[PDB]
Design a protein around this ligand. Structure first.
Ligand SMILES: CCCCCCCCCCCCCCCCCC(=O)OC[C@H](COP(=O)([O-])OCC[N+](C)(C)C)OC(=O)CCCCCCCCCCCCCCCCC
Ligand SMILES: NC(=O)C1=CN([C@@H]2O[C@H](COP(=O)(O)OP(=O)(O)OC[C@H]3O[C@@H](n4cnc5c(N)ncnc54)[C@H](OP(=O)(O)O)[C@@H]3O)[C@@H](O)[C@H]2O)C=CC1
Ligand code: SF4
Ligand code: SF4
Lengths: 340, 174, 43, 6, 386, 316, 38, 198, 156, 27
């Protein structure tokens, strides 16, 4: 079972990767389908969002490259038919807010298991499972711990299943960068420990995507637990200010106990419509980026990471004002890098 | 022979006439009368789903492949329908069917490429490809618009009765 | 076999000229009725 | 109105 | 940049797609540099790769308000190169549908002009009449517009049995419909203002910038290629060119309403005097054989097969043939090698010249004036962009 | 009670305001040989409610612009227009104001800002050019609009709109003062930016403050314009066409007020379809050259008619 | 007055062709033979 | 058979000599072809002079420029064949003056003689690449703003080398080398049998 | 009372409002524009169905791309698609915009608008008949009717 | 098919006879 790769390399060409991608509608997802579609791969995108929302993905895929299937996580049968004819399964199912009808376990461990489980029954050559970086089975945030729980299980349902483990991602439409920039509405921008001792290493979304895609088309990655990290680390302080810097909005880092702040996250979490901050998110935000001692991701998988400052201008531009909208990054001052 | 579209005394009667035209907007009132008049005319619109705008037999509409009464598809893959298509829409590849006869393995009209010229209707010697009456085949996805032999043959079977009547009415003219 | 052709003797005649009618109350008469209305109203 | 025959 | 402001491609005011990069000191236009090619599609290069009969459908699309009149220009051109001329009935047909098409163009030009000006009821009044005309096209060609009826050797198929009668009922009444528009716009106390003395073009300047259309006729130059250089049987009919004086948006308009009137005079005649006969040349060499003949006679099948698959095989030469399309002089310069597919086919578009004049017409004019002048040139971006 | 009398006088007008768009999209239709909207609901009665719901649901995109001079502008437009119905004297008014017409003139004048604020807020060229011209003709027309009223008042004796019901107990003020009615009607057409005078929404000209306004903001001005369309027509139906008043039965006043207002509201609908739009300068050429000299002179005639015809109106 | 250039007219720089299709494309000048069929 | 009127063939021929004598210097060939159309062929340097004589001569007033075009015969050393078609509302006739221009040997501009040519000359530069000296503002008219290559040249691929699609990653339209999903089927149509020239 | 029911009904209302009043912003590139002006015209009144004659790039619910989307106009189309509200839709009209049409192999024509704007209903025909557009606009109305945005919110 | 009164309102308002040249095509 395979498809000889013919063509010159662009759209309307063939690469031979038929791939179910269950959580494509996501920020990371959007990018994964982009490269897969650019390369000419056959992409099956399972969806449970309404057809109007899935429209953005149609255009990057060539005619007949993208197939959309109706799928429900609780219903095992839907996952069954999606992987019927795929040979690569990529799992990006994740959320930050435990929803009424889906718990962190479900979105991270429960569902992503059933999926790979079926994929095996199907006989998919490889499964790529994505879990957050620094995910201990004991990490504070229920999210991270639960994700850790999953990367274990799925091994047993699907052995030698690649497990890329990305850091918080930097990209347009990302949270890491937009969240902080959107603190503008808040007059003061709380920062636990005044934004210190939680060094963070962002990674451009595309780098992550390209990396993921390259995995699909490379035999070197099997059972590998890569870690796409980034080109430079940062104390949360510079990051926050830098953001506000490009956004050209004032910065008032304010110390606020994580204790009390976990409570603020609880407050937003209470909100019915997509809580903006999450008790877990808060914790995750402060969880310091771990140093790298694992299977190299970017570069190792073939893409050289892209510095944050380089594309930050595009992600944070929408947050500027009438005039600030015309400033460029090189006249601006780039913040210092703290490896710690 | 030519004509001057706009090629051109002052008397109280005249002036008073002209001044009244400017002062009490007499010609403007004339224009209002015309629109009030139609307000009273019967509207020309048709209930679109219930009543349909009339199309006579030559209407080109949607492509279909016909079959002989017996049940043998008319096309014999001479492939000049492909030759004369202006848009390169029709793609035909053929091979001798086991019967030994000549038939098209693949006949694909790309309707998005097709500009509905109706020359294919013209060119076919057996008149296998015809411009069918239906114009309502709008589709949610681009792929549905690309049509293979099975869709066109199915289109042919569905509309054969009217296609036969339409060709019956217009063949003397051709 | 029959060919659509003009009816025998030709068709009837069509209008190719504007038939816009120059119909209006004469200006003096128009002003007088109006001024008379204001005079009655003022009284 | 392609054909005036029902 | 004197507040340079793209008229913008998406604008109801701009026919189709026109970026008019205009520098306006407040509400006065200092300079208009129209941008074109927003609808270039390759029509001239594509034709080189297609046979003569499969390039006929391109001409309908060049300026599709005037669907057929354009075909006639290619027809005539291909007939000249072959030194073949159409049969007598076909000629009258082409003049019959040639004129019907002129009306269709003028109903568009006059009513669309008003919609940009702000009068919206004339468009609905005359689009119903248009609709009725389209139906003629459909019952003759099969398509409402983009017919492909006028082919290089005559028309494709004789008129349905009964069309002439209906092209009469309509013609018998259409006049009143033009009359109505009139009672609404010709003398409106306001149409005149926005149109009168706007975009006056001198006579010498109109010839110099190659205007060649109503635009020339409106300035008082008397030139109708249909009377000066008769094509088809427009010679046997009798009509009056509507020349204008004090050429300005209002005067030319009056001219377009007058040719709508004169075309009804030409249509009447064509119905009164169309001859019994064939509608396509009898040279199977140029015109495709009748389907009864190709299905019973070998020479006819061979001629049907070769004509549809390969082509006319026009003798080598080059010709510039111009007709009087509703917009103005539409001409095809068709260079041709002995091959069945053309070598070059520059389409002269009445419109490439007219737009150019926008600059020399709209000078010291307000934003609203520019909208009025694009209307008085009947710009269909298909012909300009080709 | 007074609260109930605020629902009535508001809702009723809002519901009627919705039915005007419908009677606009059908009367323009039949004039143009088309049925107009009849498929949604019965005879299109549910049509106004339908797009209202579509408009509010669609995203109110805030341009990459002010965020207040953007949201203040529609609120002001709806607030002033609905407010000006407060003192209108149908039968007897809700809040009778001794200087009532000055209230109506002042409240109208404030709406010109909403146009100015929306145009500055959008921060795109089409909006600013449109607003500057729009503000210009609105206040230009205000100058003749005000003088035309001052001529009226001097023959009414007071600024209170309630007095005209007693002034017009024998004859409409159209018979006298018809020359100004026409000039009040044309000015009412300019101030509601309706057709003959609608270069603001001129589409071919400046596609204009509403350009960047979509969804909820679009609706509020929108609602405002149409309510105004009625209010100004209603002021014509009190000041110049005086509906018959019988003290014993107050509703025949409102019944005829209903009939005359609807017909004159129908008239600006009919004007729109019938006429092309005037040029920006052609519009101001009319007011400053054609109308202002007529109005100022006829203003003097209305200070003289009272005195030498010993008809000075009774104050109060 | 005319100027002298011994440089083979190369106008590869003006034609507007992508670099790949000017350096990797071999064209053959041949007189077409006849389909033996005819 | 077309209704040829020899009356014309002669009168136009006679004018063709007239012009040839009046401007011996630039006219290389003059020929009234069948179809009764006269074409005076001029050396490229005679662009200004030959046109001006036709625009302003009492016995030959050719006031409007119907068209300016450039066939491209790749075989011909001088690739382009600029053709100017002119009409004479006074003598109701048409003449075509055609010159030859190579890719990098520019022709003079006639915007002076006829301002109609302001646009067509820009059209010829954009499509064929001929350059016109003394042109007021020569710049691409029909092609895209960033288009590379002159399209109507016989050596330019129909489909071209670049096509546009919207890319989400970059959220902007982006060129890519053309990849077609059904190449233009190049039917060979010439028949191996000629037609004995009448 | 089951909210699920309460939700469906509510959604329907929402769908009825958008589906009854679709204000189309039409481009009129090319000619298929003439066949849409016919729809707006009296035989086939678009308004009767709640489709407004025309609106600006903002207040527009649906964009009808009529005509060839040439490479120069391709950046604009997008801009205007990107300048419309959150509930927006695109009805491709014409073989010249469904795919490439007679001009598919040209160097200046984008082979389809669905390469530049996501397309919801493709209306076929070189001059797609006005009735056919009307059929296409009516199928967009059935597409909207089926959309169930709040029920997915509730079940998400 | 319209009452003569309503029809008259039409002819009067128009100034010519629409009855002779109607918008409704008939057999
Ligand atoms: C003020 C803004 C508008 C307020 C509502 C105005 C009336 C809306 C309405 O009646 O909806 C009819 C619509 C009618 O649509 P429908 O889906 O019932 O179908 C009716 C028939 N067709 C398809 C032709 C429309 O109501 C619905 O959509 C069904 C659910 C109604 C739920 C109402 C309470 C929530
Ligand atoms: N920066 C980041 O976002 C990082 C992400 N990751 C991991 O990478 C993955 C992708 O991230 P990202 O795209 O931002 O995540 P998103 O929040 O964008 O969600 C990803 C997709 O999962 C789908 N989804 C969510 N919940 C469910 C459910 N209960 N059933 C079915 N589908 C569901 C969503 O579809 P819909 O919304 O239509 O339901 C969405 O399209 C995540 O799983 C995350 O754990 C790791 C590190 C950093
Ligand atoms: S022409 Fe008629 S028969 Fe010959 S191939 Fe095309 S369709 Fe089949
Ligand atoms: S599709 Fe046919 S009709 Fe519509 S634009 Fe392209 S060519 Fe003109």
């Amino acid at each position: 079972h395979a498809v000889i790769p013919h063509g010159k390399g662009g759209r309307s060409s063939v690469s031979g990767v038929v791939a179910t991608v269950f959580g494509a509608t996501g920020f990371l997802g959007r990018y994964v389908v982009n490269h897969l579609g650019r390369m000419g791969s056959q992409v099956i995108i399972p969806y449970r969002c309404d057809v109007y929302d899935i429209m953005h993905l149609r255009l990057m895929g060539d005619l007949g490259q993208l197939t959309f299937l109706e799928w429900d996580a609780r219903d095992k049968d839907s996952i069954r038919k999606a992987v019927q004819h795929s040979n690569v399964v990529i799992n990006l199912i994740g959320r930050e807010w435990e929803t009424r009808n889906f718990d962190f376990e479900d979105v991270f461990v429960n569902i992503p298991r059933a999926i790979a489980q079926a994929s095996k029954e199907a006989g998919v050559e490889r499964f790529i499972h994505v879990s957050h970086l620094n995910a201990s089975m004991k990490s504070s945030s229920k999210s991270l711990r639960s994700k850790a729980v999953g990367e274990k299980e799925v091994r047993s349902v699907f052995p030698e299943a690649i497990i890329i483990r990305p850091s918080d991602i930097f990209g347009r439409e990302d949270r890491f960068l937009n969240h902080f920039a959107n603190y503008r509405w808040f007059l003061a921008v709380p920062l636990v420990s005044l934004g210190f001792k939680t060094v963070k290493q962002p990674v451009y979304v595309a780098d992550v995507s390209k990396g993921i895609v390259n995995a699909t088309k490379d035999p070197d990655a099997v059972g590998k637990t890569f870690a796409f990290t980034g080109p430079n680390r940062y104390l949360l302080f510079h990051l926050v200010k830098y953001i506000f810097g490009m956004t050209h909005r004032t910065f008032i880092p304010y110390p606020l106990p994580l204790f009390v702040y976990s409570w603020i996250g609880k407050l937003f979490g209470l909100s019915p419509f997509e809580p903006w901050t999450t008790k877990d998110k808060v914790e995750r935000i402060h969880i310091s980026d771990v140093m790298p001692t694992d299977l190299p991701g970017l570069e190792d998988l073939g893409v050289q990471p892209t510095p944050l400052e380089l594309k930050s201008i595009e992600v944070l531009r929408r947050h500027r004002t009438y005039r600030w909208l015309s400033s460029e990054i090189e006249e601006t001052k780039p913040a210092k890098t703290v490896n710690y | 022979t030519y004509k001057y579209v706009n090629k051109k005394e002052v008397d109280m009667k005249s002036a008073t006439d002209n001044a009244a035209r400017i002062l009490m907007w007499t010609e403007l009132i004339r224009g209002l009368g015309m629109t009030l008049s139609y307000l009273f005319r019967e509207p020309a619109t048709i209930n679109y789903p219930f009543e349909k705008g009339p199309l006579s037999p030559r209407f080109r509409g949607e492509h279909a492949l016909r079959r002989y009464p017996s049940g043998e598809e008319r096309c014999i893959a001479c492939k000049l329908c492909e030759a004369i298509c202006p848009a390169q829409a029709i793609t035909i590849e053929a091979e001798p069917r086991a019967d030994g006869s000549r038939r098209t393995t693949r006949y694909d009209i790309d309707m998005t490429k097709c500009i509905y010229c109706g020359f294919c209707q013209e060119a076919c010697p057996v008149d296998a490809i015809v411009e069918g009456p239906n114009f309502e085949f709008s589709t949610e996805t681009h792929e549905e618009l690309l049509y293979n032999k099975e869709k066109l043959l199915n289109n042919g079977d569905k509309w054969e009765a009217e296609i036969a009547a339409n060709i019956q009415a217009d063949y003397l003219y051709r | 076999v029959k060919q659509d052709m003009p009816p025998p003797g030709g068709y009837g005649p069509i209008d190719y000229k504007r038939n816009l009618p120059r119909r209006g109350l004469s200006g003096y008469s128009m002003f007088a009725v109006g001024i008379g209305a204001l005079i009655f109203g003022y009284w | 109105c392609m054909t005036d025959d029902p | 940049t004197n507040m340079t402001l793209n008229f913008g491609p998406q604008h109801p005011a701009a026919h189709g797609v026109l970026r008019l990069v205009l520098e306006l000191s407040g509400e006065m236009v200092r300079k208009c540099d129209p941008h074109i090619g927003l609808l270039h599609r390759g029509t001239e290069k594509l034709i080189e790769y297609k046979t003569y009969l499969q390039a006929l459908p391109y001409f309908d699309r060049l300026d599709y308000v005037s669907m057929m009149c354009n075909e006639q220009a290619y027809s005539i051109a291909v007939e000249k190169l072959l030194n073949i001329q159409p049969p007598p009935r076909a000629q009258w047909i082409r003049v019959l549908f040639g004129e019907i098409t002129r009306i269709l163009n003028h109903i568009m030009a006059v009513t669309t002009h008003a919609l940009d000006i702000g009068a919206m009821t004339p468009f609905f009044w005359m689009f119903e009449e248009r609709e009725k005309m389209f139906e003629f096209y459909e019952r003759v060609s099969g398509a409402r517009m983009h017919a492909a009826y006028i082919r290089p050797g005559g028309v494709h198929q004789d008129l349905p049995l009964g069309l002439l009668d209906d092209i009469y009922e309509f013609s018998k009444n259409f006049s009143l419909r033009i009359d109505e528009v009139e009672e609404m716009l010709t003398n409106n106390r306001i149409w005149r203002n926005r149109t009168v003395d706007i975009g006056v073009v001198t006579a010498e300047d109109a010839l110099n910038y190659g205007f060649s259309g109503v635009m020339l006729r409106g300035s008082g130059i008397q030139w109708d290629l249909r009377k000066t250089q008769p094509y088809d049987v427009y010679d046997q009919v009798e009509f009056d060119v509507p020349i204008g004086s004090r050429g300005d948006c209002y005067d030319r308009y009056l001219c377009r309403v007058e040719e709508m009137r004169q075309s009804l005079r030409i249509i009447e005649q064509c119905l009164n005097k169309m001859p019994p006969g064939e509608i396509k040349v009898d040279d199977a060499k140029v015109s495709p054989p009748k389907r009864a003949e190709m299905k019973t006679s070998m020479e006819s099948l061979i001629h049907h097969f070769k004509l549809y698959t390969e082509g006319y095989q026009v003798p080598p030469g080059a010709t510039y043939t111009a007709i009087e399309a509703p917009k103005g002089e539409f001409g095809v310069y068709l260079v041709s090698d002995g091959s069945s597919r053309p070598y070059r086919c520059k389409i002269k578009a009445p419109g490439f010249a007219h737009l150019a004049g926008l600059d020399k017409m709209s000078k010291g004019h307000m934003l609203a004036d520019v909208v009025a002048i694009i209307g008085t040139q009947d710009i269909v971006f298909g012909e300009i962009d080709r | 009670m007074f609260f109930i009398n605020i629902l009535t006088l508001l809702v009723p007008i809002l519901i009627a305001m919705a039915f005007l768009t419908l009677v606009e999209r059908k009367i323009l239709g039949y004039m143009q040989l088309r049925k107009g909207p009849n498929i949604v609901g019965p005879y299109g009665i549910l049509q106004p409610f339908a797009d209202a719901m579509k408009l509010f649901m669609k995203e109110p995109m805030r341009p990459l612009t002010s965020m207040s001079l953007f949201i203040i502008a529609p609120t002001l437009s709806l607030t002033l227009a609905l407010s000006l119905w407060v003192p209108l004297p149908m039968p007897h008014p809700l809040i009778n104001l001794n200087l009532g017409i000055l209230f109506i003139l002042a409240t109208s004048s404030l709406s010109v800002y909403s146009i100015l604020w929306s145009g500055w807020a959008s921060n795109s060229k089409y909006s600013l050019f449109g607003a500057l011209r729009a503000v210009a003709q609105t206040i230009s027309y205000e100058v003749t609009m005000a003088i035309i009223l001052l001529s009226v008042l001097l023959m009414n004796g007071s600024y209170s709109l309630q007095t005209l019901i007693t002034t017009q107990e024998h004859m409409w003020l159209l018979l006298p003062a018809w020359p100004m009615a026409m000039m009040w009607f044309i000015s009412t057409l300019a101030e509601t930016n309706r057709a003959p005078f609608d270069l603001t929404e001129g589409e071919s000209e400046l596609v204009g403050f509403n350009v960047e306004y979509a969804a909820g903001p679009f609706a509020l001005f929108f609602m405002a314009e149409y309510t105004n369309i009625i209010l100004m027509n209603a002021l014509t139906t009190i000041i110049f066409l005086g509906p018959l008043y019988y003290i014993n039965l107050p509703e025949l006043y409102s019944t005829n007020f209903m009939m005359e207002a609807l017909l004159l509201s129908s008239t600006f609908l009919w004007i729109r379809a019938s006429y092309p739009r005037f040029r920006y300068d052609q519009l101001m050429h009319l007011l400053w050259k054609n109308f202002l000299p007529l109005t100022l002179a006829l203003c003097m005639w209305h200070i003289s008619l009272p005195i030498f015809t010993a008809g000075v109106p009774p104050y109060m | 007055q005319l100027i002298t250039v011994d440089e083979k007219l190369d106008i590869t720089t003006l034609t507007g062709v992508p670099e790949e299709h000017i350096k990797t494309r071999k064209v053959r000048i041949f007189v077409p033979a006849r389909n033996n069929m005819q | 058979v077309r209704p040829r009127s020899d009356v014309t063939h002669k009168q136009l021929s006679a004018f063709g000599e007239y012009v040839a004598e009046i401007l011996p210097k630039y006219v290389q060939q003059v020929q009234v072809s069948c179809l009764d159309e006269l074409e005076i062929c001029i050396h490229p340097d005679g662009v200004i002079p030959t046109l001006t004589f036709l625009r302003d001569h009492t016995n030959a007033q050719f006031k409007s420029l119907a068209d300016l075009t450039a066939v491209d015969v790749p075989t011909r050393q001088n690739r382009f064949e600029i053709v100017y078609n002119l009409l004479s509302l006074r003598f109701n006739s048409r003449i075509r003056v055609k010159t030859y221009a190579d890719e990098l040997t520019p022709i003079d501009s006639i915007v002076s003689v006829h301002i109609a040519a302001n646009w067509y000359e820009r059209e010829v530069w954009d499509m064929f690449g001929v350059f016109f000296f003394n042109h007021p503002d020569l710049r691409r008219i029909l092609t895209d703003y960033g288009f590379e290559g002159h399209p109507f040249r016989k050596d330019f691929p129909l489909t071209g080398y670049v096509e546009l699609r919207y890319d989400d990653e970059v959220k902007r339209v982006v060129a890519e080398p053309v990849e077609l999903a059904q190449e233009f089927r190049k039917f060979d149509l010439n028949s191996p049998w000629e037609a004995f020239p009448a | 009372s089951r909210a699920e029911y309460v939700v469906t009904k509510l959604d329907d209302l929402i769908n009825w409002a958008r589906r009854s009043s679709l204000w189309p912003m039409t481009f009129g590139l090319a000619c298929c524009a003439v066949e849409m002006m016919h729809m707006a015209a009296p035989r086939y009144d678009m308004d009767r169905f709640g489709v407004v004659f025309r609106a600006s790039p903002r207040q527009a619910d649906v964009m009808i791309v009529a005509g060839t989307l040439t490479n120069k106009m391709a950046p604009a189309l997008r801009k205007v698609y990107d300048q419309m509200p959150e509930p927006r839709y695109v009805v491709s009209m014409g073989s010249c915009a469904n795919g490439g049409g007679y001009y598919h192999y040209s160097y200046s024509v984008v082979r389809g608008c669905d390469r530049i704007v996501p397309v919801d209903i493709y209306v076929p025909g070189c001059p797609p008949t006005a009735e056919a557009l009307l059929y296409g606009i009516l199928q967009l109305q059935r597409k909207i009717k089926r959309e169930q945005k709040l029920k997915i919110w509730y079940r998400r | 098919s319209a009452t003569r009164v309503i029809q008259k309102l039409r002819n009067w308002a128009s100034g010519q006879d629409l009855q002779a040249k109607l918008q409704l095509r008939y057999q």
